[PDB]
Amino acid sequence: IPEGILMEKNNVDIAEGQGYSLDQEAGAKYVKAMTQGTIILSYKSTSENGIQSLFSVGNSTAGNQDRHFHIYITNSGGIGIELRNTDGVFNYTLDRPASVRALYKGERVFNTVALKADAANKQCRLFANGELLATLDKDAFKFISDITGVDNVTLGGTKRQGKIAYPFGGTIGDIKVYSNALSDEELIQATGVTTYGENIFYAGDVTESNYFRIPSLLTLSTGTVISAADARYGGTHDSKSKINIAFAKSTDGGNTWSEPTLPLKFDDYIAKNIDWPRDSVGKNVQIQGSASYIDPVLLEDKLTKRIFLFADLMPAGIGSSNASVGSGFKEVNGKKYLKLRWHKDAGRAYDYTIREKGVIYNDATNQPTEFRVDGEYNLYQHDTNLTCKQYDYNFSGNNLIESKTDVDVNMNIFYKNSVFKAFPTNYLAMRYSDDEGASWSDLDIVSSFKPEVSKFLVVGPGIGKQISTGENAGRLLVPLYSKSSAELGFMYSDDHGDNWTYVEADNLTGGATAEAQIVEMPDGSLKTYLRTGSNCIAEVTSIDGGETWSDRVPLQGISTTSYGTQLSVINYSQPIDGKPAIILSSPNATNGRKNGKIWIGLVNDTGNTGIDKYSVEWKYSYAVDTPQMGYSYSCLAELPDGQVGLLYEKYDSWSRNELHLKDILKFEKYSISELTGQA
Ligand SMILES: CC(=O)N[C@H]1[C@H]([C@H](O)[C@H](O)CO)OC(C(=O)O)=C[C@@H]1O
């Protein structure tokens, strides 16, 4: 077996189910006996077949169907390999979901993939579109030379008992088979030749997070486009984990993005890049004692030009599912104050309050203590800043070890080792900025209005809304949802963000996930679209600036799952087909978060008044990729040019099989021409 390229083929069209034989290639004899090596190939799949082998080498004879090696892709964008010589001898597998795509902007596109079988390092590595996807370490290194009775080298399928299995359909742009193991750098470079859309936040950036979720995108009146997202450090798990809120902006219409910042973050647990295990056991493990911020909402007050960032604030070890029932506040002298528990009192004895100027009072004696908190809620004892040891987290097999380090961080009321601990329910936090993110204000916990009977009261991630016309012109609104007297809710402000008022939009006590986004009608009335626990997206209308809302009505014609997925709906500044238009994004499949689509809805005046004044005709739908390709949370934004920007999760964020995937938050842009099927 010579050193270097053993075989190369270009521009091979493969009819679905036919495959293509490489047995007469000069180097087939070498490829059939490879002890290690590298395979790199460019392809365009035109088939919807479940599993599609790109390249294979094996035994095609009767009874030898489990004797082969193949690199394959799935119609859902997964990619992987199977190295087999019957299960009793060996069955090595490696894969990663949502690694490749099929369609981009209405046309089938090429993807570049690579498999590296490194004998010297006893390791197998998969790459695709500039990314290292997965790694397999085996003490008993095996390759093609280890398969019994190899008799074929095939493109577009795997020969099993004389039949073409895992049938590919499309074009193999180029395939190169090397006897040697190329470097990871060479492969990142080689496969990186085909990329689609761009990343704002990514694994390796200054956030020090390997994972991201929950996108927020907003174009400011100044033309600057801003964005935010959960920077999920301990895998992609929801709260009761270590999560911070990342932020970035673009001053060139979304072409390039600034070095990300972390406006909302906690330091009780270190922020670091860690590969979370994806095996059947480890994937379920999450960080237990860390505080976190989760689900961002961005909003601009066009009058003052001030921007706001809201997010749920989870005390140490808390998430929505394990939050305690209560507001977290106590009323004294008619005023609500954040309540605290001295670490040496009874488990549920919150006999202290944070009052004016952060001074902590003893409620029993009604006298101030020697403690106080600053604008960041960090503790001070007699004007000295208190501190505690920061925690680190590492896996020891399938067990996640959370241990204290020697690093001192400021003691915060939301940390597990604080001497004064906040009530274990969730809070609503916010910071404002008058310089587009160069600096942010102190931490403002606006949830003093949280019903004492509620388990959780959280935000509907995405963007907020400011009424532009009518009697309530200027009012700021942020969507909320909860497990309490109401499900859907909202908080609004008439004094440009200084103070907020809570509104219950229904009387549902089930606590279903009613994440919503708000859109304004021509006369200033509002229509809110929301996720529900039923098989449809719901619509509610308000004619009094969000103070009262109509009963839910299903959004007819736009399919979804029972559990649902967050959606994005925005106003568009110019008319489409001569009418006011709103744009909606959401996965369209009835099972699984996949088949994402962008819809354009035209506003019609029915001729009636009040709640029934307007009707929306969802005239256009745009499919982002093929039907099985993953698509979850998203956020649309009208860019300074006519375009519509989209920051979304390109995978299935609900699936227990697609957890902990890096670089799945993508940014794409589309013209109204594209969106309306007008090419
Ligand atoms: C605060 C919080 O936990 N938010 C999470 C929310 C929630 O858990 C709910 O009950 C519905 O699943 O769900 C999801 C989700 O991908 O489905 C993402 C959010 O980040």
Per DSSP, the residues of 564-627 read ----EEEEEEEEETTEEEEEEEEE--SSSSB-EEEEEEEEEE-S--GGGSEEEEEEEEEE-S-T
**Cα–Cα distances in Å, from 650 out to 25, 98, 126, 179, 263?**
39, 7, 19, 35, 25
The resolution, in Å, is 2.0
User: Residue 237 Cα, ligand 1 centroid: separation in angstroms?
Assistant: 9
Look at the block and give the residue holding tokens 């003691």: 411
Domain co-membership, 440 together with 411: no
Question: How far apart are the C-alpha atoms of 402 and 393, rounded to whole Å?
Answer: 4
What amino acid occupies position 408?
A: D
3-state secondary structure 42-90: EEEECCCCCEEEEEEEECCCCCCCCEEEEEEEECCCCEEEEEEECCCCC
Question: How far apart are the C-alpha atoms of 596 and 636, rounded to whole Å?
Answer: 13
Task: Give the containing element (helix H, strand E) for 516.
Answer: strand 516-520
Token pair of 611, please?
Answer: 């709640």
Question: How far apart are the C-alpha atoms of 556 and 34, rounded to whole Å?
Answer: 57
Neighbour-count burial of 660, counting CB atoms closer than 10 A to its CB (0-12 exposed, 13-18 middle, 19+ buried): middle
Query: CA angle 581-587-592, nearest 5°?
Result: 165
- Cβ(72)–Cβ(55) under 8 Å? no
Q: Is 636 helix (H, G, I), strand (E, B) or coil?
A: strand
| Strand 292-300 versus strand 462-463 pairing type | parallel
Q: Answer yes or no: 638 catalytic.
A: no
DSSP state of 356: G
**Cα–Cα distances in Å, from 516 out to 43, 57, 442?**
40, 51, 27
Domain co-membership, 515 together with 625: yes
- The verdict on the CB of residue 216 being under 6 Å from ligand 1 is no
Q: Is 10 helix (H, G, I), strand (E, B) or coil?
A: strand
Domain co-membership, 482 together with 553: yes
**Cα–Cα distances in Å, from 478 out to 53, 355, 458, 648?**
48, 26, 10, 20
What amino acid occupies position 306?
A: R
Give the CATH number, domain containing residue 102.
2.60.120.200
Exposure of 622 in the CB half-sphere (CA atoms within 13 A):
25
Domain co-membership, 353 together with 459: no
Sheet bearing 553-554, strands edge to edge = 516-520, 526-530, 538-542, 553-554
Question: How far apart are the C-alpha atoms of 312 and 670, rounded to whole Å?
Answer: 31
| Terminal CA-CA length for the chain | 51
- Cβ(598)–Cβ(644) under 8 Å? yes
Domain co-membership, 487 together with 430: yes
Q: Give the list of residues 6+ apart from residue 432 with CB closer than 8 angstroms, or none.
A: 306, 307, 308, 309, 440, 441, 444, 497
Nearest to 447, CA basis, from 573, 313, 357, 566 = 313
Domain co-membership, 217 together with 136: no
Sheet bearing 243-250, strands edge to edge = 211-219, 225-232, 243-250, 261-264
Question: How far apart are the C-alpha atoms of 151 and 97, rounded to whole Å?
Answer: 31
- Cβ(496)–Cβ(522) under 8 Å? no
DSSP state of 486: -
Domain co-membership, 158 together with 282: no
Query: What range defines the domain where residue 494 resides?
Result: 197-324+425-679
| β-bridge partners, 246 | 229
CA torsion 518-550-494-458 (nearest 10°) is: -60
Question: How far apart are the C-alpha atoms of 190 and 326, rounded to whole Å?
Answer: 56
User: Residue 33 Cα, ligand 1 centroid: separation in angstroms?
Assistant: 50
Question: How far apart are the C-alpha atoms of 378 and 343, rounded to whole Å?
Answer: 15
Question: How far apart are the C-alpha atoms of 500 and 459, rounded to whole Å?
Answer: 14
Domain co-membership, 22 together with 75: yes
Q: Give the list of residues 6+ apart from residue 394 with CB closer than 8 angstroms, or none.
A: 274, 400, 401
Task: Give the containing element (helix H, strand E) for 673.
Answer: helix 672-675
Boundary residue ending a domain (159, 174, 196): 196
**Backbone phi and psi for residue 189, each to the nearest 5 degrees, phi listed first:** -60, -50
Domain co-membership, 499 together with 610: yes
Query: CA angle 606-607-610, nearest 5°?
Result: 85
Domain co-membership, 54 together with 183: yes
- Cβ(276)–Cβ(282) under 8 Å? yes
Token pair of 361, please?
Answer: 């009072």
Q: From the candidates 131, 146, 230, 238, which is the catalytic residue?
A: 238
Token pair of 337, please?
Answer: 């104050």
- The verdict on the CB of residue 312 being under 6 Å from ligand 1 is yes
Pocket test for ligand 1, best of 238, 427, 458, 567 (most atoms within 8 A of CB): 238
Nearest to 298, CA basis, from 463, 82, 536 = 463
Question: How far apart are the C-alpha atoms of 269 and 284, rounded to whole Å?
Answer: 19
Look at the block and give the residue holding tokens 């568009």: 572
- Cβ(374)–Cβ(359) under 8 Å? no
Neighbour-count burial of 349, counting CB atoms closer than 10 A to its CB (0-12 exposed, 13-18 middle, 19+ buried): exposed
What amino acid occupies position 362?
A: N
Look at the block and give the residue holding tokens 């989760």: 294
Query: CA angle 351-355-360, nearest 5°?
Result: 55
Question: How far apart are the C-alpha atoms of 282 and 396, rounded to whole Å?
Answer: 10
Q: Answer yes or no: 275 catalytic.
A: no
Q: How far is CA 283 from the centre of its chain?
A: 17
Question: How far apart are the C-alpha atoms of 300 and 474, rounded to whole Å?
Answer: 11
CA torsion 220-221-222-224 (nearest 10°) is: 20
Question: How far apart are the C-alpha atoms of 662 and 259, rounded to whole Å?
Answer: 18
Q: Give the list of residues 6+ apart from residue 21 with CB closer than 8 angstroms, or none.
A: 152, 153, 154, 155
Question: How far apart are the C-alpha atoms of 260 and 665, rounded to whole Å?
Answer: 14
User: Residue 296 Cα, ligand 1 centroid: separation in angstroms?
Assistant: 12
- The verdict on the CB of residue 484 being under 6 Å from ligand 1 is no
User: Which of left, alpha, beta for 283 (phi over 0: left; psi -120 to 50: alpha)?
Assistant: alpha
Token pair of 607, please?
Answer: 């001729």
Query: Any known ligand binding at 213?
Result: yes
Token pair of 654, please?
Answer: 């609900």
Question: How far apart are the C-alpha atoms of 232 and 201, rounded to whole Å?
Answer: 11
DSSP string across 359-418: EEEETTTTEEEEEEE-TT-BEEETTEEPEEEEEEEEEETTEEEEEEEEEEEE-BTTSTT-
- Cβ(450)–Cβ(339) under 8 Å? no
Q: Which ligand 1 atom minimizes the distance to the CA of 653?
A: 16
The residue contributing the CA closest to ligand 1 atom 5 is 238
Token pair of 172, please?
Answer: 């193999």
The residue count of the chain comes to 679
- The verdict on the CB of residue 458 being under 6 Å from ligand 1 is yes
Q: From the candidates 620, 633, 651, 670, which is the catalytic residue?
A: 633
| β-bridge partners, 334 | none
Query: How many other β-carbons are positioned within 10 Å of the β-carbon of residue 281?
Result: 10
Query: CA angle 56-58-59, nearest 5°?
Result: 145
Q: Answer yes or no: 238 catalytic.
A: yes
Boundary residue ending a domain (406, 424, 442): 424
Question: How far apart are the C-alpha atoms of 91 and 138, rounded to whole Å?
Answer: 11
Question: How far apart are the C-alpha atoms of 102 and 30, rounded to whole Å?
Answer: 32
Give the CATH number, domain containing residue 343.
2.40.220.10
Q: How far is CA 349 from the centre of its chain?
A: 38
Query: CA angle 544-547-551, nearest 5°?
Result: 90
Q: Give the list of residues 6+ apart from residue 39 with CB closer than 8 angstroms, or none.
A: 55, 71, 114, 115, 175, 176, 177, 178
- Cβ(165)–Cβ(67) under 8 Å? no
The residue contributing the CA closest to ligand 1 atom 11 is 513
Question: How far apart are the C-alpha atoms of 48 and 102, rounded to whole Å?
Answer: 10
Alpha-helix residue ranges (DSSP H) falling in 154-236: 184-191
- Cβ(70)–Cβ(155) under 8 Å? no
User: Residue 238 Cα, ligand 1 centroid: separation in angstroms?
Assistant: 6
Question: How far apart are the C-alpha atoms of 207 and 209, rounded to whole Å?
Answer: 5
Rg of the Cα atoms in the chain: 28
Query: Any known ligand binding at 593?
Result: yes
Give the CATH number, domain containing residue 572.
2.120.10.10
Domain co-membership, 164 together with 271: no
Sheet bearing 20-21, strands edge to edge = 20-21, 152-155, 51-58, 67-74, 79-85, 91-96
- Cβ(363)–Cβ(330) under 8 Å? yes
Boundary residue ending a domain (424, 442, 471): 424
**Cα–Cα distances in Å, from 250 out to 247, 258, 550, 568?**
11, 6, 38, 20
Domain co-membership, 406 together with 465: no
Token pair of 646, please?
Answer: 């989209």
Total tally of structural domains belonging to the chain = 3
- The verdict on the CB of residue 28 being under 6 Å from ligand 1 is no
| Strand 488-493 versus strand 456-459 pairing type | unpaired
DSSP string across 20-47: EE-TTSTTHHHHTT-SSEEEEEEEEE--
